[PDB]
Design a binder for this molecule. Structure first.
Ligand SMILES: [Zn+2]
Lengths: 73, 49, 224, 50
DNA sequence: GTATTCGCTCTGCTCCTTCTCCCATCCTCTCGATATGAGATCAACTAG
DNA sequence: CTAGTTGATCTCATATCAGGAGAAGGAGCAGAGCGAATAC
RNA sequence: CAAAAUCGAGAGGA
């Protein structure tokens, strides 16, 4: 689950964050969650789940992954 | 009715006892006279007001 | 010759829009626009690429998107911007080694792990250094495409501009429009790169039919 | 008709609202606060916590 | 040149489906189920 | 230095229904608002 | 000088 979550929060083609680090929406997440990596990472996820494009990036559709059994489609 | 009651209450009450214990266990009165938890945050400035 | 055509098209690039961080980029399809002989265009582009004047980069937004960049603009912008924004952070030296060793040697579009591990003595750490530099992006496990740092901005603007121009042609009558009419028309704010640039790209990729009429070359959408 | 002192009832209530939101006495509320991993794994749901 | 739409986006609301965890403590007892060797290497001898 | 022996080790080869509750993720619909865009 | 396995089922006791 943590693997899926980190993937869904980075660029499947260029291997970096879908969202920018310097955006206020993530800067305030960092300011809010200090010493709570769980809350930090979950905030970043629920922020990034709406993102559907890699956009100094690679601009390619980042696929809505799924899981069945032990497998990632 | 009475027998079954005595024989089916116990499980739930035992669960409640366990759950409360684990919730509150580490709160204790300090040398400051405050009450605090393990994380060292204040719960009561004086025990029982 | 294609060399001229790439020169004029490179002039059309609005460098100020990307604050001179990105070297000017020309799409192969636009090269087809000014040079109708598609085969001769490709042969002469290959000629130039072998000579080392230009680099071809897989822009990725379409499988047939190959961006064309003068090698010296590439070196200048990458050295300047990357080393400046990255003075101290380690991959500056690795990128310097890359620009010094590989780019003059092989102009190939993709880089495979074996080549960098053996022919060029690059390590996994240095490859990750490059990848974070923006200079490489993952094709496959152990395979990476050459890349320009920061190309995403240009790609986004180009995509929205292309679709906007195509939409403008669609919404004209017949789905048709005369080229002069389009060029003179006030560009939408979405179209940030200029209309001639996008028009050449559309014509070159056969997305729009070029019909030479008495009034000039008409744009018509091929029937889909 | 039973009787229980007030100190204990007050301590339970204050533990249970000390963070500003209502905390449930369950693995959802007790095990989600900042108690550090080992106590959490002791209470319930060991594997996920660790 | 501003109404006027309008399409496209961008939330964002519900609403459903999926999945995952939990079930008092301690103690005594019984009963049923759950190979063999040829050959090659190598290293320590085992001596010359 | 230098040939012969002893053990350890390893490889191959033989046949024949009377859970439930709560969190998370995605689904489908709904309207607001702003870019351009027709059009009075 | 410490000798005496594990896993499931069932029946009991407070
Ligand atoms: Zn990418």
């Amino acid at each position: 689950v943590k693997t899926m979550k980190v993937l869904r929060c980075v660029c499947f083609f260029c291997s970096k964050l879908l969202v920018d680090s310097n955006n206020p929406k993530i800067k305030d997440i960092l300011a809010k969650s200090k010493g709570q990596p769980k809350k930090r990472l979950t905030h970043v996820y629920d922020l990034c789940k709406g993102k559907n494009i890699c956009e100094g990036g690679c601009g390619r559709y980042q696929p809505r992954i799924r899981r069945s059994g032990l497998e990632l489609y | 009715e009475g027998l079954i009651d005595t024989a089916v209450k116990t499980a739930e009450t035992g669960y409640i006892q366990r759950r409360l214990i684990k919730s509150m266990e580490s709160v204790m009165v300090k040398y400051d006279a405050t009450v605090r938890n393990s994380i060292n945050q204040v719960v009561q400035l004086r025990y029982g007001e | 010759s294609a060399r001229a055509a790439v020169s004029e098209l490179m002039q059309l690039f609005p460098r100020g829009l990307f604050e001179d961080a990105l070297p000017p980029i020309v799409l192969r399809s636009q090269v087809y626009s000014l040079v109708p002989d598609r085969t001769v265009a490709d042969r002469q582009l290959k000629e130039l690429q072998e000579q080392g004047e230009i680099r071809i980069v897989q822009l990725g937004f379409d499988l047939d998107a190959h961006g064309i960049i003068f090698t010296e603009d590439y070196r200048t912008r990458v050295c300047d911007c990357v080393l400046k924004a990255c003075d101290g952070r380690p991959y500056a030296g690795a990128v310097q080694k890359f620009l010094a060793s590989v780019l003059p040697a092989c102009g190939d579009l993709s880089f495979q792990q074996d080549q960098m591990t053996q022919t060029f003595g690059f390590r996994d750490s240095e490859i990750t250094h490059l990848v974070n530099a923006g200079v490489l992006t993952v094709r496959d496990a152990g395979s990476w495409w050459l890349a320009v740092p920061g190309a995403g901005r240009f790609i986004k603007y180009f995509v929205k501009g292309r679709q906007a121009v195509l939409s403008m042609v669609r919404k004209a009558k017949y789905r048709e429009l005369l080229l002069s009419e389009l060029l003179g028309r006030r560009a939408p704010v979405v179209v940030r790169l200029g209309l001639t640039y996008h028009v050449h790209d559309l014509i070159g990729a056969q997305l729009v039919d070029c019909i030479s009429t008495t009034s000039g070359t008409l744009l018509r959408l091929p029937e889909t | 008709g039973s009787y229980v002192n007030y100190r204990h009832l007050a301590l339970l209530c204050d533990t249970m609202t000390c963070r500003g939101h209502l905390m449930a006495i369950t693995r959802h509320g007790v095990n989600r606060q900042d108690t550090g991993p080992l106590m959490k794994c002791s209470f319930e749901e060991t594997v996920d916590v660790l």
